[PDB]
Amino acid sequence: MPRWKRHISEQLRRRDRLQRQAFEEIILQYNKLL
């Protein structure tokens, strides 16, 4: 796999971990007690 393609894959996964995964559970929890 090319260098640039490996970078993007790692970046997209890093993005999800920092953005989506960080909030997905607590948002789901909060929505229930509303």
The answer to whether 32 contacts other proteins (rule: CB under 8 A) is no
Which of 26, 12, 24, 34 has its CA nearest to residue 4? 12
What sign for the dihedral angle of Cα 14, 15, 20, 23? positive
Distance CA 19, CA 11 (A): 12
Q: For other proteins, how many residues bind (rule: CB under 8 A)?
A: 21
The answer to whether 19 contacts other proteins (rule: CB under 8 A) is yes
The answer to whether 17 contacts other proteins (rule: CB under 8 A) is no
Residues that bind other proteins (CB under 8 A): 3-5, 7-9, 11-16, 19-20, 22-24, 27, 30-31, 34
